[PDB]
C-alpha cells in the first residue's frame, strides 16, 4: 500500500461476454473485485519470474454494451440467454439466468519491484501485455488484435524518477490516450456524510444507496435535485457470517489446503469521473485489504482526494 514506483498501461482491452450481473442487488458494470483478482492472477503468473510486484488497478471504461431487451414498452429490462445442451434422458434442462456484456476498457497498473533497475522498460511492458492476452478478466475472454488498423503498444511510465515539471508533463501525456471513457472511484466518505446529513429520520445506511440511485422530486409548496456527478451503487467487498474452518472440515471445498468461510456481500457507493479532473494518475488505483480477526474483506481505492 505504498506509492508505486512505476505505472504500466494496458491500452485497449476488448472483452467479449463478461459477467454483467456482478451482485445480488446491481446489474451494470462488473465488480472491481474481478479486476483486483485479475491483477493478482497476473502477478502470480508473471511477476514471480520477472521480480516485480503489481498491486494497483485503474478502471477506465472506454465503451460498454449489454445483451439486454425491452419488453412491451415496459419500464424494465430482461437478459438474452443462451441455449444449453439437452438432458441425459433427452428432453430439456432447467434454465439458470446470467447476463453477458461486451466492454472495452483500459487498465493502468502499479509496479513496486526491483526488476525495473536491471531490465529495459519496454521488455517488461511487452511481456506483461503478451501474457495478459491469453487469459480472461470477468468470465469473458480477452479478444486479440484485428487487421487493417495500427495496434497500441503499451508503455512503462516512471513515476519516482525525474523533475516535477517533467512529471506533470508525462502525466498530461498519458492522459491523452485514455480520455474517451471515464474512471471509477469509491465514495465511502460522501455516503457517510450524506447519511449524517439526513440522519434525523432513520439511521439505516442501506436507505442511503436507495436514496441516491433514484430521481427524487419534492415539488413546489417542478425542480430536479442537483446530482453532483454519476453516483452508482457497487459491491464493496465481503463480510463474514461464519467462523473460520479447517482445511479438511468442509466437504466439497475448492482446495483442501486453505481455510474456508461463509460470506455476504457489502454494498457501497462509487462515481464515474473524467480522467482530466484528478490530480495524479495514482489516485485512481484500487487496492484490497483484509482483517481476518474480523470478517472484513474489502477492496477500495485509498489515497484519493
Amino acid at each position: 500500500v505504498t506509492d508505486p514506483e512505476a505505472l504500466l498501461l494496458l491500452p485497449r482491452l476488448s472483452i467479449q461476454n463478461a459477467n454483467a450481473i456482478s451482485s445480488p442487488l446491481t446489474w451494470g458494470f462488473p465488480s472491481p473485485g474481478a479486476f483486483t483478482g485479475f491483477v493478482h492472477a497476473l502477478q502470480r503468473r508473471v511477476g514471480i519470474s520477472l521480480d516485480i510486484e503489481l498491486d494497483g488497478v485503474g478502471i477506465v471504461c472506454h465503451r460498454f454494451e449489454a445483451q439486454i431487451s425491452q419488453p412491451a414498452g415496459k419500464r424494465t429490462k430482461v437478459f438474452n440467454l443462451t441455449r444449453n445442451p439437452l438432458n441425459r434422458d433427452g428432453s430439456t434442462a432447467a434454465i439458470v439466468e446470467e447476463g453477458r456484456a461486451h466492454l472495452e476498457v483500459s487498465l493502468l497498473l502499479g509496479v513496486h519491484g526491483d526488476g525495473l533497475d536491471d531490465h529495459p522498460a519496454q521488455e517488461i511492458a511487452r511481456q506483461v501485455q503478451e501474457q495478459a492476452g491469453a487469459m480472461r478478466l470477468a468470465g469473458g475472454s480477452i479478444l486479440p488484435w484485428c487487421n487493417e488498423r495500427f495496434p497500441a503498444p503499451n508503455a512503462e511510465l516512471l513515476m519516482l524518477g525525474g523533475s516535477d515539471e517533467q512529471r506533470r508533463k508525462n502525466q498530461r501525456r498519458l492522459t491523452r490516450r485514455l480520455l474517451p471513457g471515464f474512471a471509477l472511484v469509491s465514495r465511502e466518505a460522501l455516503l457517510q456524510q450524506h447519511l449524517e446529513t439526513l440522519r434525523t429520520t432513520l439511521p439505516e445506511a442501506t436507505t442511503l444507496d436507495a436514496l441516491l440511485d433514484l430521481c427524487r422530486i419534492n415539488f413546489e409548496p417542478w425542480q430536479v435535485r442537483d446530482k453532483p456527478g454519476w453516483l452508482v451503487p457497487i459491491p464493496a467487498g465481503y463480510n463474514a457470517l461464519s467462523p473460520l474452518y479447517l482445511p479438511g472440515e468442509v466437504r466439497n471445498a475448492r482446495d483442501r489446503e486453505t481455510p474456508l468461510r461463509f460470506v455476504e456481500n457489502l454494498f457501497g457507493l462509487g462515481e464515474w469521473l473524467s480522467p482530466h479532473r484528478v490530480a495524479a494518475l495514482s489516485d485512481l488505483l484500487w487496492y484490497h485489504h483484509a482483517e481476518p480477526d474480523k470478517g472484513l474483506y474489502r477492496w477500495s481505492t485509498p489515497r484519493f482526494v
Partner: protein, 108 residues
C-alpha cells in the same frame, strides 16, 4: 464544471471516433469548429493542410467556447448591477482559462 467535461468527452469521442472528416459546408465559415474539433491529416491533406491548424495560434477556440457559454449563463442588469454576476462571470472565466491549456496541448 460537469458541463465542460461533457463537451470535452463529446469532442474527444465524436470527431475522434469517426475516421472521416471532409470539407465542411461553407468552408469560409464552417472552419472554426472544423479546425478545433477536427481530426488530423488525411488523404486530402494538401500543402497548407498540415501546416495551418497545427502551426497557427490555437487560442481563439477558448474565446469561441466562452462566447457559446455566455448564452447559457444569462446576464442582465439584474445580475450585472449586483455583485453576484461578477463572480458568476469569474467562475466561467476560471473554467474557460484552462480551455486553452488543456484544449491547446494537441497541436501546439
Amino acid at each position: 464544471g460537469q458541463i465542460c467535461d461533457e463537451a470535452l468527452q463529446y469532442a474527444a469521442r465524436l470527431r475522434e471516433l469517426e475516421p472521416g472528416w471532409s470539407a465542411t459546408p461553407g468552408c469560409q465559415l464552417h472552419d472554426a469548429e472544423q479546425l478545433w474539433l477536427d481530426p488530423l491529416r488525411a488523404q486530402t491533406d494538401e500543402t497548407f493542410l498540415q501546416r495551418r491548424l497545427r502551426g497557427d495560434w490555437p487560442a481563439e477556440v477558448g474565446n469561441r467556447f466562452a462566447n457559446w457559454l455566455n448564452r447559457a449563463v444569462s446576464s442582465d442588469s439584474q445580475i450585472l448591477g449586483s455583485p453576484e454576476a461578477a463572480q458568476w462571470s469569474q467562475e466561467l472565466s476560471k473554467e474557460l482559462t484552462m480551455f486553452k491549456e488543456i484544449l491547446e496541448d494537441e497541436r501546439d
